[PDB]
Amino acid sequence: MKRNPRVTSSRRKCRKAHFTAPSSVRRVLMSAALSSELRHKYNVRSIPIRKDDEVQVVRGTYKGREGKVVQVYRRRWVIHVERITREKVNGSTVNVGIHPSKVIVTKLKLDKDRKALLDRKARGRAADKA
């Protein structure tokens, strides 16, 4: 159990550090689990999400609906994805917010810096697997 006497175990301070986090930290919290197959490929379990990833929501009321991410909206702790969208009363079309922890990154937008991140998060997992 916690042994490091520098990390708080207080609900108040943890909720501060969560809901008051800057954008550079909200990126890391906006992480989603990879698909099983892409996990098998890249030897990592979770990744923070990007502008143009293909996600497949698994637990919202929109289960099974694959869609490209269109707007990771870090303020409201949501992401907007293609066509997973609803209709106002008047008839305007609005994308709904799905928390990043409820999507799985089926296909990944390989930036070179993302490749580097996948390398680091891969060898970190595997060097302690072995």
Partner 1 sequence: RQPYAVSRKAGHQTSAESWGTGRAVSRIPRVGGGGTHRAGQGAFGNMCRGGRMFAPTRIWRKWHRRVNVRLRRVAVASALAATAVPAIVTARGHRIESVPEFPLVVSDSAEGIEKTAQAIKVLKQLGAYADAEKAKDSVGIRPGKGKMRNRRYINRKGPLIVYGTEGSKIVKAFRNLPGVDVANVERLNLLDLAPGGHLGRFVIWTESAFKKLDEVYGSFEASSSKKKGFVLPRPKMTNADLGRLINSDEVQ
Q: Please, which of residues 17-46 interact with RNA by CB under 7 A? A: 18-20, 22-29, 31-33, 36, 44-46
Binding residues for partner 1, rule CB under 8 A, total: 4
Find how far residue 2's CA is from the centre of its chain: 26
Instruction: For the beta carbon of residue 115, count every other beta carbon within 10 angstroms.
Output: 11
With 0-12 CB in 10 A as exposed, 13-18 as middle and 19+ as buried, what is 56?
middle
Q: Residues 66, 99, 106, 107: which binds RNA (CB under 7 A)?
A: 99
Tell me the CA distances in angstroms from 40 to 14, 54, 58, 64, one per residue in order: 33, 17, 19, 21
What minimum distance in Å lies between the beta carbon of 11 and partner 1? Answer: 6
> Minimum distance from CB of 128 to partner 1 (Å)?
15
Q: How far is the CB of 25 from partner 1 (least distance, A)?
A: 23
Give yes or no for residue 1 binding partner 1 (CB under 8 A): yes
Binding mask 9-48 for partner 1 (x = CB under 8 A): xxx-------------------------------------
Partner whose footprint covers residue 18, from RNA, partner 1, none (CB < 5 to 8 Å by kind): RNA
> Residue 20 gets which letter from DSSP?
T
Which among 41, 60, 49, 64 has a CA at the least distance from the CA of 105?
A: 49
Give the footprint of RNA on residues 46-65 (CB under 7 A).
46, 48-51, 58-63
**Cα 34 to Cα 47: distance, rounded to the nearest angstrom:** 7
